[PDB]
């Protein structure tokens, strides 16, 4: 770290009116009460009403940026039709240098922390001047908060019980 902090790239309020945002899950909990990760969001339709999205951002802060997102893999289809109303998955997370698309299906998996479902997590750096875009037909995890930073040099990592 030379600088590192947390900001609100896309406030939960007023970013996503047209998708219900507030859903969470129960293994992700706090003092035995359900929750979900602070920095991110679920999106689903407005009473079974999914429109598809295109949103973007580029830096004004002039510092470097660190960005995270997710790609939903249900364990069953009834979720997929119920929430997002397309068996088709197609996301396109796009930048100048990096870009990638995502087109998953349901893959059943075994229970792990009482979960068969999965969301594969994906990330990138973004520099000043450059733009990120997200495009999707659902099956997403979006940023609520993102990590502003400068670089750092030479510090690192320890595993220790001391």
């Amino acid at each position, epitope marked *: 770290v030379s600088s590192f902090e947390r900001f609100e790239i896309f406030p939960k309020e007023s970013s996503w009116p047209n998708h219900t945002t507030t859903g969470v899950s129960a293994s992700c909990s706090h003092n035995g*009460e359900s929750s979900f990760y602070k920095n991110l969001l679920w999106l689903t339709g407005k009473n079974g009403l999914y429109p598809n999205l295109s949103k973007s951002y580029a830096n004004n802060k002039e510092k470097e940026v660190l960005v995270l997102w997710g790609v939903h893999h249900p364990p069953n289809i009834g979720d997929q039709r119920a929430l997002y109303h397309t068996e088709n998955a197609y996301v396109s997370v796009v930048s100048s240098h990096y870009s990638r698309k995502f087109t998953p299906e349901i893959a059943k998996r075994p229970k792990v922390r009482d979960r068969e479902g999965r969301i594969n997590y994906y990330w990138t750096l973004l520099e000043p001047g450059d733009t990120i875009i997200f495009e999707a037909n659902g099956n997403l995890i979006a940023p609520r908060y993102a990590f502003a930073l400068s670089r750092g040099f030479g510090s690192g990592i320890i595993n220790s019980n001391a």
Partner: single-chain antibody
Amino acid sequence: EIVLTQSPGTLSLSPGERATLSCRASQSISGYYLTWYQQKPGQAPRLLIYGASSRATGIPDRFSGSGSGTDFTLTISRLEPEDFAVYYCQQYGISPVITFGGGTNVEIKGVQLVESGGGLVQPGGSLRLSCAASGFTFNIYDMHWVRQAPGKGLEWVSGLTTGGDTSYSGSVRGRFSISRENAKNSLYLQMNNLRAGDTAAYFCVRGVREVGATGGDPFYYAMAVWGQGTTVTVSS
């Protein structure tokens, strides 16, 4: 959340007949947003229809509905004396507030929860209820406490999502207080400052799969299941 209006609160009709029932609101309100129940007096409610078209589990084919926006509708293909019942209209506010139609009597012419503590207190008094779960994961679902006066329109007293966003009515709030326990598989409702408006039969209700879990449970934006309820009263 919006005031509803059922149409009609009671009706009298013959066998081998349809029955059109229209539950309409103040505003236009988007359509996978309602669900539809029945209840026999003495029995708890039972789930029938959701989102103005689509049909629940363990079913015939006869009850079927339509409508959109401001005016939602459930219709019936055939009437039978086993249907002798009050049907209800229960909607999930975007303000996370269930709202209720006033029940609609069909007259025909010629797993579980368990409640705890229903009974009497003095008015202006104080009392608690509990509920307790059986054969599921009380972790997941968004819960609701509900009321009903005898042969009257329901009222939605309270509910809470599993991440802590409470919702009460502006009248009932502060006098009631809830608390949930998933490791216990049980629920609590401590209550104070109690008057004759609370003289009614209450229900504990399991609702909505939040987002994510293993299971052969899907979800709706309907209830999951009710409980048998219990009477509560003030008097002197």
